[PDB]
């Protein structure tokens, strides 16, 4: 299949990360992050959308602590606050970026309906043709750091991705997103940086610098 321009938007490991496709939809995403952030920054607007009795699977608006911007999120789990049983703690999945955070319900609002239009932008992927250097599954922190560096995750670095394989999703050991429960396979991709001067793509770079092993 054909190559596509992407950003790597979030990383768990080289075999679990998220991409956003660059194009009309990424421009619309950036615009939506702007509009949502402007909108939900007003208390009147937030009161138009006060959260009551949240539930798993609900799509909401939430503040991201690290940039004070508002994002679409899916409630993946809800548990009692252990200090404070009168409150809950929410496990959120940011549907357009792919990262997850635990959040207080005080930082969540109902999502204004027209913000649902744009399709969820983050696509979960794994890096094709690699496996961990640890064989006794887990990646060394140095390998994760290296992958984060090569992708420049969350710094808007254009990469070229190509889907070259698929694999079944592992059975879940934690609460997961509704989409991760639909039977859809995970795409395994080649990734390369058109701006780095290497002919090697990111898999081959990681393998030849001892950060990964070939499959």
């Amino acid at each position: 299949s054909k190559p596509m321009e992407v950003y790597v938007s979030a990383v768990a490991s080289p075999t679990k990360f998220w991409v956003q496709l660059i194009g009309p939809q990424s421009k619309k995403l950036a615009s939506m992050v702007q509009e949502m952030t402007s909108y939900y920054s007003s208390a009147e607007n937030r009161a138009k959308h006060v959260l009551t009795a949240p539930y798993v699977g609900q799509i909401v608006a939430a503040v991201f602590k690290f940039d004070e911007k508002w994002y679409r999120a899916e409630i993946v789990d809800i548990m009692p606050n252990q200090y404070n049983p009168k409150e809950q703690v929410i496990d959120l999945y940011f549907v357009d970026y792919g990262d997850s955070e635990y959040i207080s319900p005080a930082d969540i609002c109902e999502l204004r309906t027209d913000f649902l239009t744009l399709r969820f932008q983050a696509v979960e992927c794994f890096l094709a043709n690699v496996k961990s250097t640890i064989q006794t599954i887990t990646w060394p922190k140095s390998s994760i750091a290296k992958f984060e560096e090569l992708t420049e995750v969350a710094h808007w670095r254009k990469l070229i991705a190509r889907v070259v394989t698929y694999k079944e999703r592992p059975r879940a050991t934690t609460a997961v997103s509704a989409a991760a429960k639909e039977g859809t396979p995970l795409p395994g991709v080649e990734l390369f940086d058109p701006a780095d001067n290497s002919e090697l793509n990111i898999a081959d770079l990681m393998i030849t610098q001892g950060f990964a092993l070939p499959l």
């Binding site: 979030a10 990383v11 768990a12 990262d99 990646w139």
Partner: peptide, 9 residues
């Protein structure tokens, strides 16, 4: 467990 994605701009 290396299953949760992280974003740090």
């Amino acid at each position: 467990d290396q299953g949760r994605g992280r974003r740090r701009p």
